[PDB]
Ligand binder design. Structure first.
Ligand code: ZN
Ligand code: ZN
Ligand code: ZN
Length: 272
């Protein structure tokens, strides 16, 4: 946790210039937390926020593109940890937007706590009410734009990956805002962070490998190597964010890391 907090006041708060990523999806996060605006014909969708102390920064980034924070109608969450939820209560109150999140993450959101470590104030965030609790396959529509919820638990109990279609020239491309599949601070064994966590992770890796996704996105830019792609982006060159093999490759890496951490945490149960 100490190192988690160290990273959270370093790459996670460092600037990154907002940009149009593909079609109606805009990057407005930091160098280390990815946040998105999705422009629809009936207002904006905000996909996540960042650390609680970074809300003004995210609002400023939205402005740099000429979007209005006031025009946010829906706030969607990938998963309910403070580095993604820290601005929800504030932006919701300022805008009147509705918050949409995976049903099993509702208790987290509504209590502002880290599951299985509820007394840790360093992982707390301002509590926020969930307006629509989603399940696998639910469709969330604003104007011309529809995202589909995919239940991909593990990193959190209600982790939701959100799929949408965009255009690249005349052709459709499928985008996935992947929710996260890292072990990170979670306990897998002993006193697991929540019941059924291990089966959820391995179900999620399998699910992720079976999806047909052209553009992998996630809640940190390292999920999809954002910075290297942004540097390659040129008017009249293919959009570097289109890499259809990427979610299978990434979920394979996550599964291998999972196995290593499950084995480390299992070895650590043996009390010396
Ligand atoms: Zn997380
Ligand atoms: Zn995170
Ligand atoms: Zn699904």
């Amino acid at each position: 946790i100490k190192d988690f907090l160290a990273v959270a006041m370093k790459k996670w708060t460092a600037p990154f210039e907002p940009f149009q990523l593909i079609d109606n999806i805009y990057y407005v996060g930091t160098d280390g937390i990815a946040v998105y605006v999705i422009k629809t014909s009936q207002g904006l969708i905000l996909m996540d926020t960042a650390m609680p102390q970074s809300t003004g920064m995210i609002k400023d980034n939205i402005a740099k593109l000429g979007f209005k924070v006031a025009d946010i109608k829906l706030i969607l969450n990938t998963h309910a940890h403070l580095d993604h939820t820290g601005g929800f209560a504030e932006i919701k109150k300022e805008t009147g937007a509705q918050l949409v999140a995976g049903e099993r993450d509702k208790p987290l959101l509504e209590g502002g706590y880290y599951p299985g470590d509820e007394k840790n104030e360093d992982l707390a965030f301002p509590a926020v009410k969930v307006d629509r609790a989603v399940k696998e396959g639910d469709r969330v529509t604003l104007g011309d734009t529809t995202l589909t919820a995919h239940a991909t638990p593990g990193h959190s109990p209600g982790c939701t990956s959100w799929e949408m279609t965009v255009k690249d020239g005349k052709e459709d491309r499928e985008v996935l805002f992947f929710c996260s599949g890292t072990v990170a601070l979670n306990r897998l064994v002993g006193q697991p962070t929540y019941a059924g966590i291990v089966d959820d992770y391995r179900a999620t890796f399998a699910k992720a490998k079976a999806m047909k996704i052209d553009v992998l996105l996630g809640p940190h830019p390292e999920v999809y190597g954002m910075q290297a792609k942004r540097a390659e982006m040129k008017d009249g060159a293919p959009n570097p964010f289109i890499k259809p093999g990427e979610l299978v490759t990434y979920a394979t890496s996550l599964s291998e890391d999972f196995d290593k951490q499950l084995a480390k945490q299992t070895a650590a149960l043996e009390k010396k």
